[PDB]
PDB file of C-alpha atoms and ligand atoms in Angstrom:
ATOM      1  CA  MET A   1      46.945  32.874 122.326  1.00 37.62           C
ATOM      2  CA  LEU A   2      45.576  30.411 119.706  1.00 36.76           C
ATOM      3  CA  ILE A   3      48.033  28.815 117.284  1.00 34.86           C
ATOM      4  CA  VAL A   4      48.026  30.442 113.848  1.00 41.02           C
ATOM      5  CA  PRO A   5      47.193  29.389 111.294  1.00 43.17           C
ATOM      6  CA  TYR A   6      43.871  28.545 112.989  1.00 41.28           C
ATOM      7  CA  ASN A   7      40.892  26.683 111.599  1.00 41.82           C
ATOM      8  CA  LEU A   8      37.433  27.569 112.929  1.00 41.33           C
ATOM      9  CA  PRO A   9      34.861  24.956 111.743  1.00 42.59           C
ATOM     10  CA  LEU A  10      31.524  26.592 110.706  1.00 42.84           C
ATOM     11  CA  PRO A  11      29.100  23.626 111.254  1.00 43.68           C
ATOM     12  CA  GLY A  12      26.598  23.503 108.331  1.00 45.98           C
ATOM     13  CA  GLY A  13      28.354  26.384 106.656  1.00 46.46           C
ATOM     14  CA  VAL A  14      27.325  30.030 106.900  1.00 42.45           C
ATOM     15  CA  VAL A  15      23.797  31.557 106.743  1.00 44.98           C
ATOM     16  CA  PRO A  16      22.438  35.060 106.972  1.00 45.93           C
ATOM     17  CA  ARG A  17      22.424  36.415 110.612  1.00 50.88           C
ATOM     18  CA  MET A  18      25.631  34.483 111.425  1.00 49.70           C
ATOM     19  CA  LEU A  19      28.203  36.822 113.046  1.00 48.36           C
ATOM     20  CA  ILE A  20      31.858  35.736 113.164  1.00 48.10           C
ATOM     21  CA  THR A  21      34.076  37.640 115.609  1.00 47.10           C
ATOM     22  CA  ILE A  22      37.908  37.500 115.475  1.00 47.24           C
ATOM     23  CA  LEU A  23      39.941  39.178 118.298  1.00 46.04           C
ATOM     24  CA  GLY A  24      43.693  39.552 118.024  1.00 46.00           C
ATOM     25  CA  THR A  25      46.715  41.842 118.100  1.00 47.52           C
ATOM     26  CA  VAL A  26      48.808  42.700 115.049  1.00 45.62           C
ATOM     27  CA  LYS A  27      52.459  41.626 115.418  1.00 48.04           C
ATOM     28  CA  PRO A  28      55.192  44.332 115.208  1.00 46.82           C
ATOM     29  CA  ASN A  29      56.360  45.050 111.608  1.00 50.24           C
ATOM     30  CA  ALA A  30      53.408  43.037 110.220  1.00 51.04           C
ATOM     31  CA  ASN A  31      53.286  42.233 106.482  1.00 50.25           C
ATOM     32  CA  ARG A  32      49.935  40.424 106.013  1.00 47.56           C
ATOM     33  CA  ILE A  33      46.723  39.034 107.653  1.00 43.55           C
ATOM     34  CA  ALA A  34      44.235  36.629 105.983  1.00 45.56           C
ATOM     35  CA  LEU A  35      40.731  35.364 106.711  1.00 49.87           C
ATOM     36  CA  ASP A  36      39.801  32.565 104.313  1.00 50.66           C
ATOM     37  CA  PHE A  37      36.190  31.342 104.361  1.00 50.25           C
ATOM     38  CA  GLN A  38      36.573  27.915 102.632  1.00 46.02           C
ATOM     39  CA  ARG A  39      34.260  25.639 100.675  1.00 43.35           C
ATOM     40  CA  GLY A  40      36.515  22.557 100.561  1.00 43.65           C
ATOM     41  CA  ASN A  41      39.602  23.689  98.546  1.00 42.79           C
ATOM     42  CA  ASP A  42      37.771  26.814  97.232  1.00 41.85           C
ATOM     43  CA  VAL A  43      37.994  30.130  99.063  1.00 45.07           C
ATOM     44  CA  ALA A  44      34.526  31.775  99.045  1.00 42.89           C
ATOM     45  CA  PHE A  45      35.854  34.962 100.706  1.00 41.34           C
ATOM     46  CA  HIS A  46      39.580  35.917 101.115  1.00 40.94           C
ATOM     47  CA  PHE A  47      39.975  39.029 103.304  1.00 39.61           C
ATOM     48  CA  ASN A  48      43.635  40.107 103.075  1.00 39.59           C
ATOM     49  CA  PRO A  49      45.077  43.201 104.748  1.00 43.91           C
ATOM     50  CA  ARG A  50      48.522  43.884 103.102  1.00 43.05           C
ATOM     51  CA  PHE A  51      50.724  46.218 105.186  1.00 42.90           C
ATOM     52  CA  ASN A  52      53.301  46.966 102.416  1.00 42.98           C
ATOM     53  CA  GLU A  53      52.152  46.652  98.768  1.00 43.08           C
ATOM     54  CA  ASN A  54      54.627  48.986  97.075  1.00 39.42           C
ATOM     55  CA  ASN A  55      54.703  51.003 100.397  1.00 37.81           C
ATOM     56  CA  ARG A  56      50.859  51.340 100.582  1.00 38.63           C
ATOM     57  CA  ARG A  57      48.462  49.568 103.027  1.00 38.76           C
ATOM     58  CA  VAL A  58      45.490  47.953 101.219  1.00 36.99           C
ATOM     59  CA  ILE A  59      42.853  45.286 101.966  1.00 37.03           C
ATOM     60  CA  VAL A  60      42.481  42.809  99.063  1.00 37.57           C
ATOM     61  CA  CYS A  61      39.325  40.659  98.865  1.00 35.62           C
ATOM     62  CA  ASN A  62      38.889  37.794  96.347  1.00 36.12           C
ATOM     63  CA  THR A  63      37.533  34.255  95.710  1.00 34.93           C
ATOM     64  CA  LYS A  64      39.536  31.154  94.666  1.00 36.92           C
ATOM     65  CA  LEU A  65      37.725  28.556  92.463  1.00 37.21           C
ATOM     66  CA  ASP A  66      39.528  25.341  91.331  1.00 39.02           C
ATOM     67  CA  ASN A  67      42.877  26.923  92.461  1.00 38.86           C
ATOM     68  CA  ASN A  68      42.311  30.133  90.397  1.00 39.99           C
ATOM     69  CA  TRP A  69      42.066  33.589  92.024  1.00 37.47           C
ATOM     70  CA  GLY A  70      39.322  35.793  90.606  1.00 36.77           C
ATOM     71  CA  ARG A  71      38.990  39.608  90.170  1.00 35.18           C
ATOM     72  CA  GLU A  72      40.261  41.442  93.317  1.00 39.64           C
ATOM     73  CA  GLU A  73      38.110  43.988  95.180  1.00 39.86           C
ATOM     74  CA  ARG A  74      40.275  46.682  96.897  1.00 36.18           C
ATOM     75  CA  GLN A  75      39.555  48.959  99.865  1.00 36.80           C
ATOM     76  CA  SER A  76      42.118  51.697 100.802  1.00 37.70           C
ATOM     77  CA  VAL A  77      40.497  52.291 104.283  1.00 38.60           C
ATOM     78  CA  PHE A  78      42.945  50.411 106.497  1.00 36.10           C
ATOM     79  CA  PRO A  79      42.013  50.245 110.236  1.00 33.83           C
ATOM     80  CA  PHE A  80      44.862  47.838 111.274  1.00 32.82           C
ATOM     81  CA  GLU A  81      48.110  49.022 112.933  1.00 33.84           C
ATOM     82  CA  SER A  82      51.235  46.995 113.801  1.00 33.00           C
ATOM     83  CA  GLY A  83      51.312  46.236 117.487  1.00 35.61           C
ATOM     84  CA  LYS A  84      47.603  47.126 118.199  1.00 36.55           C
ATOM     85  CA  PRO A  85      44.599  44.986 119.226  1.00 35.93           C
ATOM     86  CA  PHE A  86      41.740  44.674 116.695  1.00 35.08           C
ATOM     87  CA  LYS A  87      38.250  43.136 116.480  1.00 38.92           C
ATOM     88  CA  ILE A  88      36.951  41.884 113.118  1.00 42.47           C
ATOM     89  CA  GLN A  89      33.216  41.191 112.810  1.00 40.62           C
ATOM     90  CA  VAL A  90      32.000  39.370 109.675  1.00 41.35           C
ATOM     91  CA  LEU A  91      28.180  39.382 109.453  1.00 42.07           C
ATOM     92  CA  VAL A  92      26.662  37.126 106.745  1.00 45.98           C
ATOM     93  CA  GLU A  93      23.856  38.992 104.989  1.00 43.52           C
ATOM     94  CA  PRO A  94      21.701  37.628 102.171  1.00 43.08           C
ATOM     95  CA  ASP A  95      23.727  39.203  99.258  1.00 42.40           C
ATOM     96  CA  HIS A  96      27.117  39.834 100.938  1.00 43.28           C
ATOM     97  CA  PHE A  97      29.646  39.440 103.801  1.00 42.91           C
ATOM     98  CA  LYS A  98      29.546  42.672 105.855  1.00 42.78           C
ATOM     99  CA  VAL A  99      32.896  43.454 107.669  1.00 40.07           C
ATOM    100  CA  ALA A 100      33.368  45.871 110.555  1.00 40.08           C
ATOM    101  CA  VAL A 101      36.713  46.464 112.303  1.00 40.23           C
ATOM    102  CA  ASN A 102      36.811  47.967 115.777  1.00 35.66           C
ATOM    103  CA  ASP A 103      32.997  48.621 115.557  1.00 38.06           C
ATOM    104  CA  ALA A 104      33.301  50.676 112.311  1.00 37.17           C
ATOM    105  CA  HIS A 105      31.857  49.389 109.057  1.00 37.24           C
ATOM    106  CA  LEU A 106      34.724  48.631 106.617  1.00 34.52           C
ATOM    107  CA  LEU A 107      33.418  46.835 103.496  1.00 35.18           C
ATOM    108  CA  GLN A 108      31.024  44.410 101.995  1.00 37.68           C
ATOM    109  CA  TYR A 109      31.786  41.535  99.560  1.00 35.92           C
ATOM    110  CA  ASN A 110      28.990  40.179  97.282  1.00 37.29           C
ATOM    111  CA  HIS A 111      28.553  36.371  97.443  1.00 37.91           C
ATOM    112  CA  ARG A 112      30.288  34.748  94.479  1.00 36.46           C
ATOM    113  CA  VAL A 113      30.018  31.263  95.998  1.00 34.98           C
ATOM    114  CA  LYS A 114      26.229  30.649  96.309  1.00 37.91           C
ATOM    115  CA  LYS A 115      26.258  27.390  98.408  1.00 39.48           C
ATOM    116  CA  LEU A 116      26.565  29.250 101.736  1.00 40.15           C
ATOM    117  CA  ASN A 117      25.863  26.071 103.752  1.00 39.63           C
ATOM    118  CA  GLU A 118      29.065  24.498 102.136  1.00 38.51           C
ATOM    119  CA  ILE A 119      31.405  27.263 103.367  1.00 38.21           C
ATOM    120  CA  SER A 120      32.267  25.110 106.429  1.00 41.53           C
ATOM    121  CA  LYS A 121      35.667  26.409 107.636  1.00 39.61           C
ATOM    122  CA  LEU A 122      37.322  29.759 108.370  1.00 39.31           C
ATOM    123  CA  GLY A 123      41.175  29.841 108.144  1.00 37.11           C
ATOM    124  CA  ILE A 124      42.797  32.704 110.128  1.00 38.59           C
ATOM    125  CA  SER A 125      46.490  33.340 109.249  1.00 37.72           C
ATOM    126  CA  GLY A 126      49.307  35.876 109.072  1.00 37.39           C
ATOM    127  CA  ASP A 127      51.094  38.332 111.396  1.00 37.43           C
ATOM    128  CA  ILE A 128      48.722  38.272 114.405  1.00 36.18           C
ATOM    129  CA  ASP A 129      48.499  37.047 117.920  1.00 34.37           C
ATOM    130  CA  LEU A 130      45.021  35.441 117.810  1.00 37.76           C
ATOM    131  CA  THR A 131      43.080  35.857 121.072  1.00 39.27           C
ATOM    132  CA  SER A 132      39.776  34.267 120.072  1.00 41.27           C
ATOM    133  CA  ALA A 133      37.611  33.317 117.094  1.00 43.64           C
ATOM    134  CA  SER A 134      33.871  32.503 117.513  1.00 43.22           C
ATOM    135  CA  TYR A 135      30.367  32.787 115.969  1.00 42.67           C
ATOM    136  CA  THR A 136      26.837  33.604 117.189  1.00 43.02           C
ATOM    137  CA  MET A 137      23.422  33.868 115.490  1.00 42.01           C
ATOM    138  CA  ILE A 138      21.917  37.386 115.799  1.00 42.75           C
TER     139      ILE A 138
HETATM  140  C1  5A4 B   1      48.345  37.788  93.246  1.00 40.05           C
HETATM  141  O1  5A4 B   1      48.667  37.587  94.576  1.00 40.05           O
HETATM  142  C2  5A4 B   1      47.798  36.759  95.241  1.00 40.05           C
HETATM  143  O2  5A4 B   1      46.557  37.435  95.386  1.00 40.05           O
HETATM  144  C3  5A4 B   1      45.519  36.674  96.041  1.00 40.05           C
HETATM  145  C4  5A4 B   1      44.328  37.559  96.133  1.00 40.05           C
HETATM  146  O3  5A4 B   1      43.882  37.973  94.893  1.00 40.05           O
HETATM  147  C5  5A4 B   1      46.046  36.162  97.389  1.00 40.05           C
HETATM  148  O4  5A4 B   1      46.135  37.214  98.293  1.00 40.05           O
HETATM  149  C6  5A4 B   1      47.430  35.481  97.268  1.00 40.05           C
HETATM  150  O5  5A4 B   1      47.978  35.057  98.580  1.00 40.05           O
HETATM  151  C7  5A4 B   1      47.716  33.872  98.993  1.00 40.05           C
HETATM  152  O6  5A4 B   1      46.844  33.146  98.541  1.00 40.05           O
HETATM  153  C8  5A4 B   1      48.672  33.426 100.037  1.00 40.05           C
HETATM  154  C9  5A4 B   1      49.744  34.230 100.451  1.00 40.05           C
HETATM  155  C10 5A4 B   1      50.570  33.832 101.490  1.00 40.05           C
HETATM  156  C11 5A4 B   1      50.367  32.636 102.125  1.00 40.05           C
HETATM  157  C12 5A4 B   1      51.137  32.272 103.395  1.00 40.05           C
HETATM  158  C13 5A4 B   1      49.380  31.777 101.691  1.00 40.05           C
HETATM  159  C14 5A4 B   1      48.548  32.165 100.613  1.00 40.05           C
HETATM  160  C15 5A4 B   1      48.428  36.342  96.530  1.00 40.05           C
HETATM  161  O7  5A4 B   1      48.868  37.533  97.275  1.00 40.05           O
HETATM  162  C16 5A4 B   1      50.201  37.757  97.458  1.00 40.05           C
HETATM  163  O8  5A4 B   1      50.993  36.920  97.277  1.00 40.05           O
HETATM  164  C17 5A4 B   1      50.555  39.166  97.811  1.00 40.05           C
HETATM  165  C18 5A4 B   1      50.844  40.048  96.777  1.00 40.05           C
HETATM  166  C19 5A4 B   1      51.268  41.307  97.023  1.00 40.05           C
HETATM  167  C20 5A4 B   1      51.337  41.742  98.371  1.00 40.05           C
HETATM  168  F1  5A4 B   1      51.648  43.066  98.575  1.00 40.05           F
HETATM  169  C21 5A4 B   1      51.068  40.963  99.432  1.00 40.05           C
HETATM  170  C22 5A4 B   1      50.684  39.641  99.118  1.00 40.05           C
HETATM  171  N1  5A4 B   1      50.483  38.752 100.293  1.00 40.05           N
HETATM  172  O9  5A4 B   1      49.813  39.160 101.251  1.00 40.05           O
HETATM  173  O10 5A4 B   1      50.950  37.600 100.239  1.00 40.05           O
HETATM  174 CL1   CL B   2      45.008  26.792 119.222  1.00 42.69          CL
HETATM  175 CL1   CL B   3      28.444  27.837  94.583  1.00 44.09          CL
END
C-alpha cells in the first residue's frame, strides 16, 4: 500500500483528456476520504466523501482560494462502503472534472480555477488503504 496522505505530482498541471485513476480500499468504520487537486496552496477541486455527517453519507465538493472554502456542491449518491475496494476515475473535460466510481458516472464539477496547467499536484488522504494512483492521456 502507498503511504497516505499521498502526493501525486501532475507535471504541467491538468488538461482535457487527462484521466486520473485512484485504486484503494475503504478502511473499516471510515469517517472521510479526500482528493485535493492543488494549485499551490489553493484547492481547485476538493472531492470529499463524508461517511457520517449527522448520520448521512454525502460527497462534498468545493474549491479553496487564499485559505477560504467556497460554496459546496453536494451529491447524495454515495458508492463507497467501509471495508470495500473502489476505483475513482477523474477525467478532465474542457468545462469540468468528470468523476466515475467503480465504472459508474458519479458527478461533474465545473472548473472554478481556470489555470488548469497550474493544478500540479493531487493530494489523496483519509480512511483508505491506497493501492495505486496514476494518470494517462486518452
Ligand atoms: C466546513 O467544513 C469544511 O468543509 C470543507 C469543504 O467545504 C472541507 O471539507 C473541510 O475539511 C478540510 O479541509 C479538512 C478536513 C480534515 C483534514 C484532515 C484536513 C482538511 C471541512 O470539512 C469538515 O471539517 C467536515 C465537516 C463535516 C463532516 F461531516 C465531515 C467533515 N470532514 O470530512 O472533515
Ligand atoms: Cl508511498
Ligand atoms: Cl485561475
